[PDB]
């Protein structure tokens, strides 16, 4: 919904880049190397 | 033949408690009834304060004037809400 | 009930009232419950009239009524 | 069909009769469409 | 009307109603009593006529609702009956016993009378009939 | 407010008069395309939208069903 | 309360009844 | 008579009665005692008109 | 069955799903059978002006589905077929307790 | 029987005496002067007479025979006797914030009912293991209730009179606190009750929404309700005292519950508590 | 002869229902009538001889 109003320079601002990072850290969605390594040797 | 009258009456009664089509009075009555039913449920009231629901209805000549009459009535009721009809308490005494 | 105390006797009337008045009873009236009662009672009286007339009519009539390309298959048979 | 399912306009029972019930399709005698089955047999001594 | 706040006794506040005379002002001032003014909003005077005309509007509204319901009921029944009287004689045409009817015959008939005795009480609650 | 009430009264009075007249007269009396186009002839009511948008779980976490 | 006499006269009265 | 209906399921073949909705007559009672004075006035005028007719 | 009965305002009896009451009688192990059975049981409970579906209502709704009405009613006249039915039903109940038994007649 | 006639005469005599007593009470204008002399406290007839009903229903529920109305009356007795009685006692006029917080408290507590009815058949207690539900000594429960009462009466005593407290743009923060409290509590309840199979039997570890900020969010939300309440009548001192007492008792129960579910779950809640150390207030405690 | 009086009574019952609605309708509007005020009389319309 709120990607239609936000300005593009505010979308690519460094403040927006550091907003995403602690959003991910707060959600605990930090994707690591070992996760994908176990995934790729888990698939067929 | 008296039972067929009651059959027709109760068929119409059940159709009233539906949304096929009827007079605008009954449709608005069902509208405000379902509005009250929406408002009273807390599990219904929880997901109304997010802007996605309002945005999915805002973007989809009668609705504008029917909403702005509520605005001018709200402003007039707020104006009436404050003053006193007589103004100078002392000069009334 | 005295007829048409016109407008403005009061400046004299209350001058002469207070000498002889012993006990006033003013019947100040409310307005909104009075109108509510009036309209509800009017509905009550007319609904009671029509209920009585419905009953009377149905009984009187239930009593008095029993006392009273086109020429193909038509050319070879 | 263009009509409401639950109304006065649906109070119709489909009555059917036959002589060989084993010749009917399974989907017609399927429950919900045919609810009751009555087998009327030949009369007896006193009835004759 | 009046609301005093008296200096001795119980209860301390009363109600009286007043006829209009100047000598009320004269005696009130002669006693030397404080005079103030109880001022209201506008909404206290604005719900006056609204509340005074609400119930009659309610009554006539119920009248219109019930009369409209009865009108549409009568019209629907009259249409159904007149279509019946027209169909009796025009369309596909229309509409020993007891000896062959013995055993489990009346056990279906009672159900088929009590199910069309009132089709509403099953179809208002979405409960279907014996269909076949 | 008086004009609102008066207009409502006038419309309802005419409705009552014509309803009473018709009631008096009536008591004196005694292919797939067209059905798929007519499914939603008019748009859903806004109250119906707000009713249907707020659905819930409805008894999933019960030991019986 | 307020009686309406014909030719349009609104007469104020005592309490009621 | 002779049938194939179990005795357990016999009582299930009847229709039970139902109490009428009890509330509208108390509604009428309350709406009458709210306007009991008008009821008395109309009853008295009814008797007066009936005696004038008689 | 419980979810189909609950959605229409019918409170199912808290003795046959809280215990093993109606587990030993219900079948029609496919769709269109639970719908028809629910409609039959709800109609039957409506005929007595009730809001609770007891196990007898379910039993009577099942019996109207798995039995054929017949005129010229007759019964067995030489017992011993009854003994066969009795013994077979007993051996079915005690040994195979995960299968229902249609009522003996 | 003659004794029946004798007892009918006695019953007629005593009924005549009782009806005469009632009638001479009624049509005496002096008893009308003295019995209408008590209408000035018609506000105080109800607020205390309902307390007897509340305590009677509390005893009946303690025995085990309480309908829904009586338990509703129990929580109503507690909540009303909490919020409305003290300021009515201190100032003699109730207008404004006490009314809306009396509404808000009931609107708050009727939130386990809706969640535990929507995803359930009814309000009947189900069968579970006895060790799952954490208990806590009864003296501490009574102490919590009494401290809550003490803080509420002290809040009404401490706060300025209901007409001296400001309005306008200063009463908009109060609305913000109310709404954020009820959002946090409802989110915490909806997240906690979703993962439990039985009434209180958690299948897994919850770490979502309010659980990724505060380890015990329902408790924090409840205290924040009282904190906003002490902000409403402008009594910070009572706010601090409920902070102390509610923190003490609620930390005790939190420790008991936490040790139970750490024993019963192991590493999962361990790393979860490592993720969110702050137990009640965000980065304050 | 019985049909005529049946028709008359059947007209009368619905006419009474109509009057029952109409009297309420008129009683709604009977509350907005007032005797016109001037400066000499101000609605009372009675003054000293
Ligand atoms: C209705 C709910 C009950 C409200 C109970 C409130 C209450 O008990 O207040 C008592 C005060 C007056 O006491 P006093 O100091 O005037 O003697 O009296 C009040 O202020 C009552 C206000 C009642 C509001 C209506
Ligand atoms: N119980 C009865 N009493 C008198 N007549 C009977 C009775 N039963 C059958 N009949 C005779 O049977 C004839 C009608 O048979 P019917 O139409 O019922 O057969 P059916 O069931 O339609 O057979 P099919 O289905 O093969 O047509 C009638 O002419 C009638 O004389």
Q: 3-state SS of chain B? A: CHHHHHHHHHHHHHHHCCCCCCCHHHHHHHHHHHHHHHHHCHHHHHHHCCHHHHHHHHCCCHHHHHHHHHHHHHHHHHHHCCCCCCCCCCCCC
Over its C-alpha atoms, chain E yields an Rg (Å, rounded) of: 37
Residue tagged 């509420």 (tokens): J152
- Helix axis angle, F46-53 relative to B24-40, nearest 10°? 20
CA-to-CA distance for E91 and K11, rounded, in angstroms? 37
Cis bond before residue E11 (omega within 30° of 0): yes
β-strand pairing of I69-70 with D38-39: parallel
The answer to whether the CB of J162 falls within 8 A of the CB of J91 is yes
K touches F (3+ CB pairs < 8 Å)? yes
Q: Which residues does a chain break follow in chain A (C to N more than 2.5 Å)?
A: none
Closest residue on chain C to K20 (Cα): C46
Residue of C18, C26, C39 lying closest to E55 (CB–CB): C39
Structure tokens at H23: 């509330």
- Burial of E59 from C-beta contacts in 10 A (0-12 / 13-18 / 19+): buried
| Complete DSSP assignment for J164-211 | TS--TTSSHHHHHHHHHHHHHHHHHHHHHHHSBSSTT-B-S---SGGG
d(CA D47, CA D42): 9
The closest alpha carbon to K13, from C54, C58, C59, belongs to C54
CA distance E37 to F3: 34
Q: What are phi and psi of G3, to 5 degrees?
A: -85, 145
- Distance from residue J51's CA to the centre of ligand 1 (Å): 15
End-to-end CA distance of chain H: 63
B42 and J114 within 8 Å at the Cβ level: the answer is yes
E96 touches chain B (CB under 8 A): no
Note whether H15 contacts E: Cβ–Cβ < 8 A: yes
Element (H, E) at H15: none
State whether residue G4 is helix, strand or coil.
strand
Q: Please tell me what resolution, in angstroms, this structure has.
A: 3.2
Residues in B 12-51 with any Cβ partner in F closer than 8 A: 19, 21, 27, 30-32, 34-35, 37-38, 41, 43-44, 47-48
Question: Looking at chain E, which residue has its C-alpha nearest residue K29?
Answer: E53
State whether the beta carbon of J93 lies less than 6 angstroms from ligand 1.
yes
Method: cryo-EM
Is the alpha carbon torsion for I1, I4, I6, I9 positive or negative?
negative
Mutate to test the pocket of ligand 2, among D15, D18, D19 (most ligand atoms within 8 A of CB): D19
Number of E–H residue contacts, CB under 8 Å: 18
Ligand 1 atom at minimal distance to the Cα of residue J48: 8
Q: DSSP class of residue D21?
A: G
SS3 (DSSP) at E18: coil
Of E112, E126, E131, the CB nearest to D14: E131
CA J19 – CA J22 distance, rounded (Å): 5
Cα dist from J194 to A26, I82, J120, whole Å: 22, 54, 11
Alpha-carbon distances of I61 from B63, E109, I6, I39, I53, rounded to whole Å: 52, 17, 17, 9, 11
Ligand 1 pocket: which of J46, J92, J96 to mutate (most atoms within 8 A of CB): J92
CA of J39 to the centre of ligand 1 (A): 12
Which of the ligands is closest to the CA of residue E101? 2
């Amino acid at each position: 919904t709120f990607s239609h109003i936000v300005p593009p320079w505010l979308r690519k601002t460094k403040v927006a880049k550091t907003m995403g990072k602690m959003l991910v850290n707060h959600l605990g969605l930090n994707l690591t190397k070992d996760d994908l390594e176990n995934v790729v040797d888990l698939m067929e | 033949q008296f039972k067929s009258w009651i059959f027709e009456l109760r068929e119409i009664v059940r159709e009233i408690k539906n949304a096929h089509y009827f007079l605008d009075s009954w449709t608005q009555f069902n509208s405000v009834g379902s509005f009250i039913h929406i408002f009273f449920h807390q599990e219904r009231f929880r997901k109304l304060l997010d802007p996605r629901i309002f945005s999915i209805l805002l973007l989809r000549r009668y609705f504008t004037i029917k909403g702005v009459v509520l605005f001018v009535v709200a402003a007039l009721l707020y104006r009436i809400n404050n003053r006193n009809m007589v103004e100078s308490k002392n000069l009334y005494l | 009930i005295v007829d048409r105390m016109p407008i403005d006797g009061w400046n004299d009337v209350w001058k002469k009232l207070h000498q002889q008045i012993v006990n006033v009873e003013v019947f100040n009236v409310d307005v909104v419950p009075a109108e509510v009662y009036t309209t509800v009672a009017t509905f009550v009286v007319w609904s009671m009239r029509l209920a009585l007339f419905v009953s009377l009519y149905v009984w009187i009539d239930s009593i008095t009524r029993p006392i009273y390309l086109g020429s193909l298959g038509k050319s070879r048979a | 069909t263009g009509i409401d399912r639950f109304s006065l306009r649906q109070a119709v029972i489909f009555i059917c009769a036959t002589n060989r019930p084993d010749e009917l399709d399974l989907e017609f005698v399927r429950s919900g469409r045919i609810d009751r089955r009555l087998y009327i047999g030949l009369p007896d001594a006193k009835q004759r | 009307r009046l609301y005093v706040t008296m200096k001795e006794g119980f209860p301390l506040e009363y109600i009286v109603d007043i006829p209009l005379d100047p000598y009320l002002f004269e005696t009130i001032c002669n006693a030397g009593v404080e005079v103030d003014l109880l001022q209201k909003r506008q909404i206290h005077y604005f719900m006056k006529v609204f509340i005074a005309l609400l119930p009659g509007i309610l009554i006539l509204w119920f009248i219109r609702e019930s009369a409209m319901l009865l009108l549409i009921t009568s019209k629907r029944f009259l249409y159904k009956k007149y279509n019946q009287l027209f169909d009796m004689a025009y369309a596909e045409n229309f509409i020993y016993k007891e000896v062959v009817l013995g055993g489990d015959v009346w056990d279906l008939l009672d159900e088929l009378m009590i199910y069309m005795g009132n089709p509403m009480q099953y179809y208002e609650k979405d409960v279907a009939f014996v269909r076949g | 407010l008086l004009l609102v009430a008066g207009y409502i009264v006038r419309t309802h009075l005419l409705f009552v008069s014509r309803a009473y007249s018709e009631l008096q007269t009536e008591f004196e009396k005694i292919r797939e395309f067209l059905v798929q186009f007519s499914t939603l002839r008019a748009e859903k009511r806004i109250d119906q939208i707000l009713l249907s948008l707020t659905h819930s779980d409805h008894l999933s976490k019960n030991d019986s069903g | 309360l307020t009686v309406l006499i014909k030719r349009g006269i609104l007469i104020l009265i005592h309490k009621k009844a | 008579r002779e049938s194939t209906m179990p005795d357990r399921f016999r009582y299930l073949t009847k229709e039970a009665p139902d109490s009428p909705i009890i509330w509208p007559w108390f509604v009428a009672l309350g709406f009458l005692v709210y306007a009991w004075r008008a009821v008395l006035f109309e009853l008295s005028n009814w008797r007066k008109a009936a005696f004038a007719i008689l | 069955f419980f979810t189909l009965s609950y959605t229409r305002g019918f409170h199912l009896e808290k003795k046959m799903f809280h215990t093993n009451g109606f587990e030993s009688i219900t079948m029609g192990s496919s769709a269109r059978d639970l719908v028809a059975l629910t409609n039959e049981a709800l109609s039957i409970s409506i005929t007595q002006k009730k809001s609770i579906i007891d196990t007898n209502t379910i039993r009577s709704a099942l019996h109207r589905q798995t039995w054929d009405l017949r005129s010229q009613v007759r019964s067995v006249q030489d017992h011993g077929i009854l003994f066969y039915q009795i013994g077979r039903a007993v051996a079915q109940n005690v040994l195979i307790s995960n299968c229902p038994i249609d009522p003996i007649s | 029987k003659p004794m029946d006639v004798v007892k009918l005469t006695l019953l007629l005599s005593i009924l005549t005496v009782a009806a005469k007593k009632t009638l001479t009470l009624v049509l005496d204008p002096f008893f009308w002067m003295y019995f209408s002399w008590t209408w000035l406290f018609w506000p105080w007839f109800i607020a205390v007479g309902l307390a007897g009903y509340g305590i009677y229903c509390f005893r009946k529920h303690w025995l085990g025979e309480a309908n829904a109305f009586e338990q509703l009356g129990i929580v109503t007795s507690v909540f009303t006797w909490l919020t409305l009685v003290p300021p009515a006692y201190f100032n003699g006029y109730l207008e404004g914030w006490p009314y809306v917080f009396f509404l808000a408290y009931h609107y708050f507590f009727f939130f386990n009912v809706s969640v535990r009815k929507r995803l359930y058949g009814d309000f009947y207690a189900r069968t579970h293991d006895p060790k799952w539900d954490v208990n806590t000594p009864l003296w501490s429960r009574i102490l919590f209730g009494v401290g809550i009462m003490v803080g509420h009466w002290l809040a009404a005593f401490e706060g300025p009179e209901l007409h001296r407290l400001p309005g306008g743009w200063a009463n908009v923060g109060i609305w913000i606190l109310i709404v954020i409290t009820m959002l946090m509590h409802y989110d915490s309840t909806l997240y906690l009750a979703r993962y439990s199979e039985k009434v209180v039997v958690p299948t897994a570890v919850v770490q979502f929404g309010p659980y990724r900020w505060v380890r015990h969010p329902i408790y924090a939300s409840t205290m924040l309700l009282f904190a906003a309440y002490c902000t409403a009548l402008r009594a910070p001192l009572s706010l601090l005292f409920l902070l102390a007492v509610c923190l003490v008792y609620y930390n005790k129960k939190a420790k008991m519950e936490e040790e139970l579910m750490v024993e019963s779950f192991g590493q999962s809640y361990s790393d979860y508590a490592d993720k969110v150390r702050h137990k009640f207030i965000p980065f304050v405690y | 002869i019985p049909e005529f009086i049946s028709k008359i009574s059947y007209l009368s019952v619905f006419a009474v229902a109509t009057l029952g609605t109409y009297d309420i309708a008129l009683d709604l509007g009977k509350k907005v009538i007032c005797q016109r005020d001037c400066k000499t009389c101000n609605g009372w319309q009675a003054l000293r001889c």
